[PDB]
Each structure stands twice: as C-alpha cells, then as structure tokens.
Write a protein that binds this ligand. Structure first.
Ligand SMILES: CCCCCCCCCCCCCCCCCC(=O)OC[C@H](COP(=O)([O-])OCC(O)COP(=O)([O-])OC[C@@H](COC(=O)CCCCCCCCCCCCCCCCC)OC(=O)CCCCCCCCCCCCCCCCC)OC(=O)CCCCCCCCCCCCCCCCC
Ligand SMILES: CCCCCCCCCCCCCCCCCC(=O)OC[C@H](COP(=O)([O-])OCC(O)COP(=O)([O-])OC[C@@H](COC(=O)CCCCCCCCCCCCCCCCC)OC(=O)CCCCCCCCCCCCCCCCC)OC(=O)CCCCCCCCCCCCCCCCC
Ligand SMILES: CCCCCCCCCCCCCCCCC[C@@H](O)O[C@H](CO[C@H](O)CCCCCCCCCCCCCCC)COP(=O)(O)OCC[N+](C)(C)C
Ligand SMILES: CCCCCCCCCCCCCCCCC[C@@H](O)O[C@H](CO[C@H](O)CCCCCCCCCCCCCCC)COP(=O)(O)OCC[N+](C)(C)C
Ligand SMILES: CCCCCCCC/C=C\CCCCCCCC(=O)OC[C@H](COP(=O)(O)OCCN)OC(=O)CCCCCCC/C=C\CCCCCCCC
Ligand SMILES: CCCCCCCC/C=C\CCCCCCCC(=O)O[C@H](COC(=O)CCCCCCC/C=C/CCCCCCCC)COP(=O)(O)OCCN
Ligand SMILES: CCCCCCCCCCCC(=O)SCCNC(=O)CCNC(=O)[C@H](O)C(C)(C)COP(=O)(O)O
Lengths: 14, 55, 128, 103, 88, 84, 156, 178, 459
C-alpha cells in the first residue's frame, strides 16, 4: 500500500 | 504429572511434615487455594462468556 | 444514609463532595468570572508570544523566575529569629549529632571493654 | 447548548487546514532518495564465525594460560563407589558386606 | 497492530450503523445532517447515551466538555476524524 | 502488504433481540414498565458464532476424547507386545 | 529582563501593600493569602492550596501538559513535591483513617498470629532422626583425637 | 480538550456528568452486557423521576446525596479506556512526537532526501509568515478593551484571512507518529 | 620532576605569542602532550617513593592526582571554547594564563616534599581561582561567591601556618620524610588539642566538612564552566590530600579527636543527599552531591585504616571525573537554554539522543554502579567503617539509597517526559561536546580495569 508517511525526527547526522 | 506438579506437590508435602510454624502451614494452604481460585478467574473471565470487545 | 468520606492531608476532599460550589451566590459567580478573565488574559499573552514566527528563543516565564527566586535567594532576608524557628533549628541541627555520637561512643566503649577482657573471638579478622 | 456559529466556522477552517497539512505529509515514489556509494550456508558461516572461533580462543586461553597458574581451575573429585576401578592405579574398591535383601 | 487506516466514509458508516440501532429514532428519517434536540426530539440524557454508545463502539472516550456540544452525526464524524487524524 | 480490501458492513436489520438472553431483560423491564432502547445494538454478541458457549469443566477437558482414544490404543499395544 | 518590583518581597501588614503583591502574582486580591509571618523565610509568596498536581483537570489544554501547568500562573511553593512523579493527594475511594486502621490491623494480626503459631509449633508423631557413627561425629567438625562419648541407637 | 471552558458549570452540566460517571461505573460493576443494560435502564428510571422538579433549592438539595451515593459505590477500580488519562497506554507515544521545527536543523545532506516535502514545507512557512501578520492585527482589533474574558478565539472573517493562532494547532505531530 | 614543571611554564610564552585565531589549538595540543609526559609518574614502587630531588618527591598517592590534574586542562579549554567566542584576544589569553597558572600551582603543590612549601602553593592556588570566578562569571552573585570562597578558606588555613612554624621550631624539620620517620606520640593536653585543631581545620574547611560547606554551592554555581570543573575535580582533593599527609603526627590524639568530625560528616552526608532531592537548580544539585561524597571521604580518612585510605583515594579520583562530567553536561544544557533551571527544559532525550546516553552513563557512574571505581572506593570505605563500628552501615545504606534516588531524579526530570513546547533553539549537539563527554567518561571505564593505579600507597 502506497501510504508511506514522513517521520519527523531530529538530525541524526551530527 | 505436569511441570508444576513435580515441584509444588513436593513443596506442599515437605512443608506439611516438618517441625515448622503452624500459621505458616495454614497460610501456605490458603495461598495455594487462592492460586487455584485466581487461575479460575482468569480463565472464566477471559475465555468463557459472550464477547465484550469493540465491534 | 451512607458512611461519610473524611478527608485528610494526603487524601483531599473531592470536588463533587465539596459544599462550597453548592451554596452559590452572585459574588461567587463574579469571582469565577474574574478568575477566568485573568487566566484567559495570561493564556492570550502566552499564545501571542508563542505562535510568532520571528521568535527564535525561550519564552521567559515570570512565574518560574519568581518561584526560583523565592525558593533560593529570598529565604534569609525574610528570616527572623523567633522561639519556634530557634527551637526547630537547635533541635534539628544539634539533636541528631549528639544522638549519633552517644550511640557510637557507647558501641565503641563496649567493644573496647570486650577487647580488654579478651572475650571477643577476633580470629581471622586480618583485614581492617 | 451546542456549537456557536463562530466556533463552527473556526473548527471548519482549522479542520480544512489540518487535513491539508496531513495530506502534505505523504511521501512520493521518488521522495526518498538515497545516494549510493560503496568501497544452510548462512547457518554454516554463522556457526563458524560465532561459535567455533570463540571455542578455539577460549580453549587455548584455558589450556595454556589459565591452567599454567596453580589452582585456577579446580574440579570436584569424582564420586567413588564400591566396585569401580581407578584408571591411575588399577586397584578395585571392595564391595559391600552383602546386606540382607528382602523386597 | 495491523489496524486498517479507517477513513471518513467508514467513520460515517459506523456512526449511522450505531444510530440506526437506537430504536428511539426511526432509521428512515435520520440523515447525516439531522439534529438531535429538534429534528429528532431526543432528550439530553438520550444524547449522552448516544455519545457513550459511540465511545464504546470506537474504543476511545470523548471528554465531557466536547461531548456535550455534539448534536449532529456529521459533526460527530468530524470530531472523530480530527481525533484520529484522518486524511480522506 | 496491508489490510486493504474495502470491507462492507452488514445490514442493520439483521440484528434482532430474538434468540438472545435479552428477552429476559426486556420482559423484566416491561413488567415494571420500561424498555431498553439499546437492546439491538449488542445483539451481535449473541447472534453469530458467539452464540454457543462452553462451560468451565468442558473447557478444561478440551482434548479428552482424542487423548483417551490414543491412551487406550497405546495401553492395548503395550499389553499385546509385552505379553511375548 | 525583569524589574525589581516583580521579585518576591517581605510579608506586608498593610492592605495596600497586600493588594500590590496580589496583583504582582497574577491573582485576585481576596484570593491571595501569604504564609504566616513566622521566622521562616516564606515572606511575600502566596500560600496556594496543598492540592496536588496529578489531579488537575487532565483534559484541559495546558501549556505544559506533562506537568499540568499554565504559563504565567502562580506556582506552588512545593511544585517539585507534586509533579505526578511523587506524592499526590488524589482523593481515594476509602477514607484515609480507615485505610490506615485496616492496614495496621492486618499487619499486627499477622505478626501476632505468627508469634502464636511459633509458640505452638506443628510436627509429626516421630522420634528424632538417628545417624550411625556417634551422631556422625567425625563428619561434623572432626576432632578425631578427643574420643567423644559414644551414643548408641535403640532398635525397635 | 478542543473547546474552551466556561467560568462555571450549570446545574444541567453537573447532572449530565454525574449521569455519565454513574453509568460508566455501573457498567464496570456489571461485567456482562445484559446485566448492564437492565441496570442502566433501572438507573435511568431512577434518574428521570426528578426531571420535572421546578424549584432549584430542592434540586441542589438533590444531586448531593446522589454524589455521596456515587462515591460510596464507585467501584474503586473502574474501567479506563487505554488512551484515557488513566489508561494503560495514556502517554505511550508521547516520546515519539518530535516537533516540526526540528526539521529546520537538518543537515543539507539529510534534506537532499525528501525534496518535495521540504518544498511544501517552505510553502507552508511562507503562508504562516503572511497569515501571522494579518492575524495579529485582526485579534488586536477584535478583542474588547481590558483584555479577553474567555479563551475562545474568533474564526477568519475576510476571504484570504486565516484563523488567528493556527500554526501550532494545525501542525500537531500526529496521534501515532511512529 | 622538572620535566613536567618546565613545559607547563613554557605553555605561557607559547600562548602569549600565538596567533589570534590559533590559541585554543596550541593550548589543547600541548596540554595533551604534557599529560602523556605525566603518565610516567604512575609507575610507583612498593618502597618509599620517587624522591626526585630535595624539593620534589612523588608517591603513589600523588601520582593519580597529578595525572588527573594534567589531564583536566585540555577538557577545561574545550569547555571554555564555547562562551569565550565574543571575547577579545587579550582577555582570552589572560583566561588561558589563569588556567595554566592554576595547573602549575597544583602540580607544585601535590609533590611539595616540605610542608611549608606545600602550604605556600596550597594558598597560591587561591588567587587564579578567585580571579576566574569573579571576572568571567555571568551572574551578579559572583562577587559574593568569590568573597565567601576566599574567606572561608583563609580563615581556616591561617592557624595552619602558625601550627607549621611551631612544629618546625620544636621538631626541627618539616620535610615529610623526616616527619614520618621521627614521628612521636602527641600527649593528651590542651595545647596538643589546639595543635590538632589548627592542623586539621585548614584541610577540613576546603574538603568541605558539613557545616562549613556554605561557600561551595555559591562558588560552584556562580563560577564559569572551567572554574566549576577545576573546583569539583582537583581543588576539593587538596584538603583530603593534605589531611592524609598530615595525620602522621597527630596520633594517638585523633583516636578521640575524630568524634565531632566523624559525626558531622556521617550526618551531613545524609543531610546533603536529602537536600539534593528538593533542588530547583542543576549546578547546585551537583555541588551538594560533591559535598556528600567529600563527607564520605572525610569519614574514610578519619577512620585511619589501610582500607579507608585505599577507598579514599579511589573515591577522590572517581568523584573528580564524575563531577567534572556532570558539570560539563549541565553547562551544555545551559548554553542552549540560557536559564539554568531543572524543570524549564524537559524531554531532551527525544531531541538529543547521544547527550541522553552521556547523561545516563554519568548518572550511573555517580550512582556508584559496579564495577566502576566509584563503587570500589565506596565499598572499601563502607567495609572500613563497618570494622570501625557495626552501626555505621545504617547511615551508609541510607546515603546510598538517597544517592540513587537523586541521581535518577536528575536524569528523569531533564531527559524523560514530554518536551517543553515553547523552546525551539535546541540545536543538534556539536562534535566538541560529544568529544568532551567521551574524554571524560572513557578514562573511568579504563581505570576500572587497573584499580591498583588509583588505590594509593597502602595497596
Ligand atoms: C553544625 C551542623 C548544624 C548545627 C547548626 C544549626 C543548629 C545550631 C545553631 C542554630 C540554633 C542556635 C539557637 C540558640 C540560641 C539562639 C536564640 C537567639 O539568637 O535569640 C534571637 C531572638 C531575639 O529576641 P527578640 O528579637 O528580642 O524577641 C523576638 C521574640 O518575639 C520574643 O520572644 P518571647 O519574649 O515571646 O519568648 C522568649 C522566651 C520564651 O521562650 C519560649 O517561648 C519557650 C522556651 C524556649 C527556651 C527555653 C527552653 O524565652 C525564654 O524566656 C527562655 C530563655 C532561656 O530571640 C528569640 O526570639 C528566641 C527566644 C527563645 C530562645 C530559644 C533558644 C534555645 C535553643 C536551645 C539552646
Ligand atoms: C555487558 C558486556 C558487553 C561487552 C561488549 C563490549 C562493549 C564495550 C563498551 C565499552 C563502554 C561503552 C562506551 C560508553 C559510551 C557508549 C558510546 C555510545 O554512544 O553508544 C552509541 C552506540 C551506537 O548506538 P546509536 O544508535 O548510534 O546511538 C543512539 C543512542 O546512543 C541510544 O543509545 P542506547 O539506547 O543504545 O544505549 C547506549 C548503551 C551504551 O551506553 C552505555 O551506557 C555504556 C556504558 C555502560 C557502563 C555503565 C557504568 C557502570 C560501570 C561499568 C564499568 C565497566 C567497564 C569495563 C571496561 C570497559 C573498557 C572501556 O547504554 C546501555 O545499553 C545501558 C548500559 C547499562 C549496562 C549495565 C551493566 C554494567 C555492568 C555489566 C558487567 C561489566 C563487567 C563484566 C564483569 C564480568 C563479566 C566478564 O551504541 C553502542 O556502542 C553500545 C555499546 C554496548 C553497550 C555496553 C554496555 C555494557 C558494557 C560495559 C563495558 C564492557 C565490560 C567488559 C566485558 C567484556 C566481556
Ligand atoms: C607495540 C608497542 C606497544 C606499546 C607502545 C608503548 C609506547 C609508549 C609511548 C608513550 C610514552 C609515554 C611518555 C613517557 C614519558 C616518561 C618517560 C620520559 O620522561 O623519559 C624521558 C625520555 O623520553 C623519550 O626520550 C621521549 C619519549 C617522548 C615520545 C613518546 C612516544 C610518543 C610521542 C608522540 C608525540 C607526537 C607524535 C607525532 C604527532 C604528530 C627521559 O628519560 P631519562 O630520565 O633520560 O631516562 C634515564 C634512564 N635511562 C638513562 C636509562 C634512559
Ligand atoms: C559548626 C560547624 C563545625 C565547626 C567545627 C566543629 C569541631 C570543633 C569541636 C572541638 C572538638 C572537641 C574540643 C575539646 C575535646 C576534649 C574533650 C573535652 O571536651 O571533654 C571533657 C572536657 O571538659 C570540658 O569539655 C572542658 C572544656 C569546656 C569548654 C569548651 C567549649 C564547649 C562548648 C563550646 C562549643 C563551640 C564550638 C564552635 C566554636 C566557634 C573531658 O574532661 P577532662 O577529661 O577533664 O579533659 C580532657 C582533656 N585533658 C585530658 C587534656 C585534660
Ligand atoms: C525506609 C524508608 C525509606 C525512605 C523513602 C524515601 C522516599 C522519598 C523519595 C522517593 C521519591 C518519591 C517517589 O518516587 O514517589 C513515590 C512513588 C510514587 O507512588 P506510586 O504508587 O508508584 O504511584 C502510582 C500512581 N501514579 O512511590 C514510591 O516509590 C514510594 C517508595 C517508598 C517506600 C517506603 C516504604 C518502605 C518500607 C520498608 C519496610 C520493610 C522492610 C523490609 C522487611 C523485610 C525484613 C526481613
Ligand atoms: C571556617 C572557619 C574555621 C575557623 C578555624 C579557627 C579555629 C582553629 C583552631 C584553633 C586555632 C588556633 C590554635 C593555635 C595554633 C596552634 C599552635 C600550638 O599548638 O601551640 C600551642 C598553643 O596553643 C594556643 O595558644 C591556643 C590558643 C588559642 C587562641 C585562639 C582561639 C581561637 C578560637 C578557639 C576555639 C576554636 C576551636 C573550634 C573552631 C571550630 C571552627 C569554627 C602550644 O602552646 P605552648 O606555648 O607551646 O605551651 C607549651 C608549654 N606548656
Ligand atoms: C454504582 C454507582 C451508583 C450511583 C448512583 C447515583 C445516584 C442516582 C440517583 C440520582 C438522583 C437524581 O436524579 S438528582 C436530580 C437533580 N435535579 C434535576 O434533575 C432537576 C431538573 N433536571 C434537569 O434539568 C436535567 O437537565 C435533566 C432534565 C435531568 C436533563 O436535561 P436535558 O434535557 O438537557 O437532558
């Protein structure tokens, strides 16, 4: 099913 | 002849025939009776009656 | 008739069983109106300061700063030596010290006396 | 009782904006982009790099280092019964004295 | 979890299903925009009972201050959708 | 792969108080002169496969018959094999 | 960015001073009551009710939902005591005095009956166990060079 | 939670809340459905017999012994929905709600993924930037002198206007963000 | 020893002739290099000491403290790199000069084979600290804090000078070797009682003892970050080191002169542990935790048994590292929040996960979790005090429970829960802060592998 959402999360890059 | 038997039956037998406190004897016997009682409560209230969950 | 619920310090009276809001007078309604008014004023100020796109910081709370100042840095200037304060200070700051000193002194005196008599069985007490 | 007209209008507009925002949260097929860059068999290798190698290392460590020092590994002496034979000496433990056996 | 993503039409269907089993109101007369106090002549206690029925059926409970001011099935559907963050 | 199949709700006219222990509730409310408006709403809890219930003792002996048959077969086999 | 007037001040006897303080703490003049002018340094700080902070309205849209607080409202002197993670004064189904009475009675009765049962123990109609070799003298402590008094066992 | 509260609760609201609580605790006591329906109908009967009382002194005299009776038989372990303020999963997902503004601190490498989402994000930010300037003036001109009396906010009245103070209500994280 | 003292001195001309944008790099690199040189001192022998010359000697008590002192300076520079961004070049160079002078004075103090030289440097360590506290401090109470810190110390330490010169007049030498070898019992007399009090009070005020600890929360709260770490890590250990050095001539008077201080410490540990529970500030909470731990160290030193001394040294090192880490974390939180209040910022674990991990590790170490050296020192002191008297276990267990309670309260209030809504300047944690926490914590988990290096001379 094409219902993928955006998961807001803090910047884990640093 | 189940897993809990080989332990609990011997526990109760050894407890019944030792020079121990009598109140502990009575408390243990009432405790195992209540153990059976709440097992019955779980089974009866979660597996027997008519369904009560949302539609 | 039913047994009454007696409130205590750690179990307060429920709002439903409280009798203050059943004896209603116009001044009580006025008081509730003023309370809601000041609460709504504070809420409006906070929401105005909160949704501002230009703000990029922490909304300073006067209540929190006032509470911290009252708890920490305003105790001594409002302190006065009174019989209650003096008695409480003397008790709570002196009694435990002397109580523990007496207990430990008695225990160590007993131990030393037993050591002098030699009836203590200190075998294997190598580490100390 | 019930909604006032101002409350109804505000709730309707807020609901419209909320639904727009929620719909905007969806991810398109190309929305997630990852840049690629690189510099029985499963169980067979697993038992080798996870079981066999620790056994080898620990066996070496115990056999040639731990047992080098005295009293590091001490084993309870095996039970000796009447009738068994000892490997080191070969002597035979004498049997019992033939207790009376009924039932 | 495996919970299906309930949608607006599903919510409306469930609301009407619950209402149509409330025999105090006739299924034919009711509509998604029908009122409760005036168009159906229901008591305040009756409205509380409908609210509790939807509470039980949907598995989440509505606060009193928000439950006492829901008078139409459409706004009940809207409230449930806002609570559960339904897109369409 | 998720649960997307466009489920369709049943018809509301299927649920009836008939054949459920809600008759006793309705009758004792009518004896004192009232009715339960929500009687049909829960008829589904007594209508479908949930209609038949099992007692506690019957629940405990869930597989008594098969186990007893296997036990008898095993005992007979042991009797006929050891007697040799 | 806070003026000197905003900060807490000494307890004030005068009504005009009292009014100024009540307005400062963002509360009604007749709703404001300072701590008693004792030696302790509470000074000019409102004595809010000892009502806890777990039982505030859980459905109101608080500015701080976890603590159940509003921005700018006066803060209880003992907020860190009541943060829903610590002591709470939520009303209970049973009265506090009866709860204490029942718990103390149950514990005291249990202790007394345990002591009573200790006074009257429970056993079996048997004699003491018999061990062969001088009550297993060598296997319990040893001391083989003392030749203990030999205890013999009565066959029956 | 959505609706702003009033300064006080009327007698009708108190009666309705007591009715709801009594029905909930009766359902908790009577586990099974048929028993619950029977006793709920009995409670409704005993609840509506004083519906038509006229004087308010006697009505306030009632609903006091009613509250005492409720407190005496309140089932000290009532049923609480899992998402209720007393439920087993009340604040279970409150640790997954990350604020929207956190996305402003993402590294450009992280923003390289999901480009369309961030474009829509910039559009929303511009919309908010203009709407705030309009809303502050609208609220300033709409509020009565002396400060607001209730915490109810007015809707948008013009065509291009948006409801005042909408950004942090519209951009709630989710019910179950993860 | 001069191979250590000379490079520390050369750090000053190195800093003052550096370029305007390269002072931090040079200072950090050469401070780390100096720490490596200091590592050689750790290889002590079971015999007397490493008597370098007539002026400096090193023991297995001085070696861990010296290594910690030399290791702390790079961390202080990395911590101070943040809030000195908008500072002129001359003032930044003056700050680094003060830090270097503090390190040099501490290094010369910890060896100090003669007691008068030890006292001179022990009071010399007071000027750079006061300048740092009162100059680069944010709050307006830094002046009062500096006055308290100066006078509480100096009033206690002034009779110590008179006691020392009197001892030199009678004994004839103050060299610690001669003092140890020629020690004679102190008779029970009023003059000897006052000599004991003079020689002890100067070190007990700095530790600090319960009842004289009022200067410590002020000095720790109002100081900048570097001053806070140097106070909590090294400057508190001066009193304990001096007390363990000087109790060699106070026997057998101590056998009954330790009762007031033992009771004060064993009750003040409970009092300050309880105080930590109800605290509206983070730095104040950490300062009171330091007071509790130092009270335990006081008890250990006053017991005067080998296990007491070993546990005291281990607890000294462990508490220094842990308190420095906790102050670092509090400063990183305060820089973003700009408030310094525990309940103002909540739920930071959702926004900063790695800093939440560092918080958890620091709290666990402070909680005295096995097999960390915190618990090694704790348990050694517990066993020694139990040998002293069987009733001390009640007080020590109460302290342990309260310590766990307030440590986890500090962790939970700032890390768990729902984040505060009206704060939107919580930027992702820099690499500098993560590196600072890692360099704080890794030596602890490494020293737990070789405890004998920090167990003191009575190992
Ligand atoms: C190191 C670790 C921690 C330890 C440190 C912490 C603990 C130690 C330090 C702190 C405790 C030390 C305090 C002891 C002395 C301090 C008292 C003081 O400074 O007086 C200031 C203060 C100045 O007097 P004031 O301002 O002119 O009068 C104000 C009062 O309203 C006027 O009051 P009043 O006239 O109505 O009543 C006074 C009267 C009545 O006293 C009483 O009410 C009860 C009697 C209590 C004392 C006798 C037992 O007192 C007497 O007659 C008893 C005299 C003996 O005196 C008092 O207010 C207190 C008077 C009672 C003295 C009680 C002290 C006894 C404590 C045990 C020793
Ligand atoms: C059990 C032994 C395991 C041995 C395997 C080797 C492990 C080497 C680790 C060395 C120390 C770790 C360095 C500390 C900072 C960690 C770096 C980091 O940021 O993590 C992010 C990194 C990547 O995750 P991410 O998703 O990118 O970051 C998201 C957030 O960070 C979210 O982070 P998170 O949710 O994933 O949580 C982070 C995690 C990691 O953070 C930590 O808390 C690690 C520190 C735990 C120690 C707490 C202080 C207590 C004192 C213990 C001192 C023992 C040290 C021994 C020598 C160590 C040598 C350096 O925290 C925990 O899981 C809870 C730890 C509490 C454990 C309590 C049990 C302690 C005593 C156990 C017995 C120890 C002696 C055994 C003696 C008898 C047996 C032979 O995760 C890890 O690297 C985890 C490392 C594994 C955890 C080790 C915990 C126990 C091991 C302690 C030392 C081993 C003893 C030697 C026995 C060998 C056999
Ligand atoms: C596979 C190997 C594994 C183990 C590796 C171990 C390496 C250890 C390196 C770290 C050493 C720590 C420093 C030790 C300093 C204490 C000893 C020092 O003071 O001794 C001095 C001597 O020091 C050395 O000459 C210089 C060592 C300094 C450099 C150590 C190696 C690492 C330096 C790294 C610097 C940066 C590298 C480049 C970065 C870009 C003076 O000795 P001296 O008192 O006369 O000796 C008298 C006795 N004699 C006559 C028998 C000699
Ligand atoms: C407040 C925060 C902490 C600060 C530091 C606290 C520690 C300071 C306390 C001083 C420790 C003890 C001082 C004296 C100990 C000697 C034992 C003596 O006190 O007991 C009796 C002594 O009797 C009386 O105590 C005489 C002294 C009475 C006068 C002293 C003042 C007492 C109260 C003052 C408290 C003030 C402390 C803080 C000052 C700022 C025993 O009588 P005796 O066996 O015959 O004489 C023993 C000594 N000999 C053998 C050398 C002859
Ligand atoms: C000994 C006394 C120990 C002193 C206790 C110090 C406690 C103060 C600080 C603790 C922090 C406060 C706190 O955490 O909040 C209390 C917290 C919240 O309550 P909940 O029930 O979980 O709430 C659920 C509904 N929301 O509850 C607690 O943790 C309370 C814990 C205190 C325990 C005190 C009672 C201990 C009594 C022990 C006596 C028995 C001795 C052992 C007998 C065996 C002998 C062989
Ligand atoms: C944070 C504040 C702490 C303040 C600490 C101040 C108290 C320190 C303890 C007393 C300090 C003075 C002691 C003197 C220095 C020692 C010198 C010495 O030992 O010589 C003695 C001399 O002893 C003295 O002269 C002592 C006189 C003390 C006068 C000053 C009193 C100061 C206050 C006394 C009470 C304080 C004690 C408790 C303080 C607790 C902290 C507040 C030997 O005399 P001889 O001449 O050799 O006699 C031999 C022939 N028979
Ligand atoms: C197990 C727990 C048991 C708990 C038992 C609780 C006690 C039960 C008995 C309660 C006694 C009473 O009814 S106390 C009676 C309180 N007084 C009145 O009801 C007077 C007028 N009532 C109204 O006006 C209301 O609004 C109303 C008409 C009801 C609805 O109006 P709606 O048109 O807006 O629905």
């Amino acid at each position: 099913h094409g219902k993928r959402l955006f998961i807001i999360k803090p910047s884990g890059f640093y | 002849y189940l897993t809990g038997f080989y332990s609990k039956d011997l526990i109760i037998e050894a407890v019944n025939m030792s020079y121990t406190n009598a109140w502990a004897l009575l408390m243990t016997l009432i405790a195992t009776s209540l153990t059976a009682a709440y097992s019955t409560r779980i089974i009866f209230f979660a597996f027997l009656g008519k369904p009560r969950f949302p539609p | 008739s039913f047994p009454k619920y007696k409130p205590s310090r750690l179990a307060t009276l429920p709002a439903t069983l409280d009798p203050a809001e059943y004896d209603i007078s116009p001044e009580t309604r006025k008081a509730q109106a003023e309370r809601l008014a000041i609460r709504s004023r504070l809420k409006r100020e906070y929401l105005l300061q909160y949704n501002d796109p230009n703000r990029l910081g922490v909304i300073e709370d006067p209540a929190l700063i006032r509470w911290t100042y009252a708890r920490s840095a305003n105790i001594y200037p409002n302190f006065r030596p009174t019989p209650k304060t003096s008695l409480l200070g003397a008790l709570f700051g002196i009694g435990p010290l002397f109580f523990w000193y007496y207990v430990f002194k008695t225990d160590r005196d007993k131990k030393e006396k037993l050591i002098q008599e030699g009836k203590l069985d200190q075998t294997f007490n190598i580490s100390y | 009782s019930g909604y006032t007209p101002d409350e109804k209008l505000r709730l309707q507009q807020l609901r419209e904006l909320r639904r727009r925002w929620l719909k905007d949260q969806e991810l398109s097929p190309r929305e997630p982009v990852l840049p690629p860059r690189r510099v029985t068999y499963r169980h067979s290798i697993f038992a080798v790099t996870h079981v066999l190698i620790p056994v080898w290392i620990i066996h070496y460590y115990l056999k040639y280092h731990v047992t080098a020092k005295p009293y590091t590994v001490v084993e309870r002496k095996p039970r000796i019964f009447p009738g068994d034979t000892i490997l080191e000496t070969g002597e035979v433990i004498p049997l019992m004295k033939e207790f009376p056996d009924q039932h | 979890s495996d919970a299906p993503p309930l949608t607006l039409e599903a919510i409306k269907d469930r609301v009407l299903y619950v209402l149509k089993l409330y025999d105090k109101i006739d299924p034919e007369k009711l509509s998604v925009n029908s009122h409760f106090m005036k168009d159906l002549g229901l008591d305040s206690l009756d409205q509380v009972e409908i609210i509790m029925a939807m509470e039980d059926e949907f598995g989440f409970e509505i606060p009193d201050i928000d439950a006492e001011k829901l008078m139409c099935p459409q706004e009940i559907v809207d409230y449930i959708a806002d609570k559960k963050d339904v897109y369409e | 792969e998720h649960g997307h199949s466009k489920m369709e709700l049943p018809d509301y006219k299927q649920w009836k108080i008939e054949g459920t222990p809600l008759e006793t509730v309705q009758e004792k409310l009518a004896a004192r002169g009232l009715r339960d408006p929500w009687g049909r709403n829960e008829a589904w809890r007594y209508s479908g496969g949930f209609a038949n219930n099992v007692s506690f003792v019957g629940a405990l002996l869930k597989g008594f018959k098969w186990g007893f048959a296997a036990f008898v077969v095993a005992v007979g086999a042991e009797y006929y094999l050891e007697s040799q | 960015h806070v003026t000197k007037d905003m900060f807490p001040g000494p307890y004030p006897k005068t009504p005009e001073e009292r009014a100024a303080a009540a307005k400062k703490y963002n509360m009604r003049v007749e709703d404001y009551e300072p701590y008693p002018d004792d030696g302790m340094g509470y000074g000019d700080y409102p004595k809010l009710p000892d009502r806890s902070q777990q039982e505030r309205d859980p459905w109101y849209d608080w500015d701080h939902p976890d603590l159940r607080l509003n921005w700018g409202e006066p803060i209880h002197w003992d907020l860190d005591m009541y943060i829903r993670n610590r002591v709470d004064t939520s009303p209970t189904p049973v009265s506090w005095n009866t709860m204490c009475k029942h718990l103390f009675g149950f514990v005291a009765f249990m202790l007394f009956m345990f002591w009573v049962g200790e006074i009257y123990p429970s056993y079996q109609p048997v004699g003491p166990k018999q061990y062969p070799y001088n009550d297993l003298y060598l296997e319990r402590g040893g001391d083989p060079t003392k030749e203990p008094e030999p205890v013999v066992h009565y066959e029956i | 939670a959505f609706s702003a509260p009033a300064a006080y609760l009327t007698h009708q609201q108190k009666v309705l809340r007591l009715y709801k609580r009594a029905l909930r605790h009766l359902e908790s006591w009577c586990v099974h459905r048929d028993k619950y329906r029977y006793f709920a109908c009995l409670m409704r009967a005993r609840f509506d017999e004083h519906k038509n009382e006229k004087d308010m002194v006697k009505a306030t005299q009632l609903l006091r012994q009613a509250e005492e009776e409720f407190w005496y038989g309140q089932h000290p372990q009532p049923y609480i929905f899992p998402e209720s303020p007393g439920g087993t999963s009340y604040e279970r997902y409150e640790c997954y709600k990350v604020p929207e503004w956190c996305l402003d601190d993402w590294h450009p490498s992280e923003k390289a993924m999901y480009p369309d989402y961030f474009a829509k994000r910039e559009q929303w930010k511009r919309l908010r930037r203009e709407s705030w300037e309009r809303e502050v003036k609208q609220l300033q001109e709409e509020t009565p002198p002396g400060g607001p009396r209730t915490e109810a906010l007015p809707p948008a009245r013009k065509e291009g206007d948006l409801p005042p103070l909408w950004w942090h209500i519209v951009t709630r994280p989710r019910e179950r963000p993860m | 020893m001069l191979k250590i003292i000379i490079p520390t001195t050369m750090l000053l001309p190195m800093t003052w002739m550096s370029k305007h944008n390269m002072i931090w790099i040079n200072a950090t690199v050469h401070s780390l290099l100096i720490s490596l040189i200091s590592l050689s001192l750790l290889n002590q022998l079971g015999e007397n000491s490493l008597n370098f010359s007539l002026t400096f000697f090193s023991d297995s008590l001085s070696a861990p403290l010296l290594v910690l002192t030399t290791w702390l300076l790079p961390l202080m520079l990395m911590a101070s790199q943040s809030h000195l961004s908008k500072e002129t070049t001359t003032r930044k160079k003056l700050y680094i000069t003060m830090l270097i002078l503090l390190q040099l004075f501490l290094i010369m103090t910890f060896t100090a084979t003669e007691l008068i030289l030890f006292y001179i440097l022990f009071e010399a360590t007071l000027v750079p600290t006061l300048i740092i506290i009162t100059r680069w401090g944010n709050q307006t109470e830094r002046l009062n804090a500096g006055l308290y810190f100066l006078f509480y110390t100096l009033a206690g330490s002034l009779p110590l000078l008179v006691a020392l010169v009197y001892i030199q007049n009678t004994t004839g030498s103050l060299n610690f070797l001669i003092i140890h070898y020629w020690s004679h019992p102190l008779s029970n007399s009023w003059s000897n009682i006052f000599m004991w009090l003079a020689c002890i009070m100067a070190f007990m005020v700095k530790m600090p003892l319960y009842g004289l600890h009022l200067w410590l929360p002020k000095a720790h709260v109002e100081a900048p970050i570097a001053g806070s770490m140097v106070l909590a890590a090294v400057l508190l250990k001066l009193g304990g080191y001096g007390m363990m050095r000087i109790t060699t001539i106070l026997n057998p008077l101590t056998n009954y002169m330790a009762y007031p201080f033992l009771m004060l410490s064993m009750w003040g540990m409970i009092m300050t542990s309880s105080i930590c529970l109800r605290q509206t500030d983070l730095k104040s909470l950490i300062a009171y935790s330091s007071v509790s731990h130092m009270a335990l160290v006081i008890v250990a030193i006053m017991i005067q048994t080998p296990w007491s001394f070993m546990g005291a040294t281990a607890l000294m090192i462990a508490h220094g590292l842990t308190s420095s880490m906790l102050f670092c974390l509090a400063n990183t939180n305060y820089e973003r929040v700009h408030s310094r209040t525990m309940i103002l910022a909540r739920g930071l674990q959702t926004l900063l996960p790695l800093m939440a991990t560092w918080w958890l590790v620091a709290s666990l170490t402070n909680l005295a979790l096995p097999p960390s050296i915190n618990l090694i020192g704790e348990l050694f002191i517990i066993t020694a005090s139990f040998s002293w008297s069987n009733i001390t276990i009640i007080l020590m267990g109460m302290n342990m429970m309260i310590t766990a309670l307030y440590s986890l309260y500090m962790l939970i209030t700032t890390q768990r829960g729902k984040y505060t809504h009206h704060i939107n300047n919580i930027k992702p944690s820099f690499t500098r802060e993560n590196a600072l926490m890692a360099l704080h914590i890794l030596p602890l988990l490494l020293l737990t592998l070789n405890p004998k290096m920090i167990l003191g001379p009575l190992y």
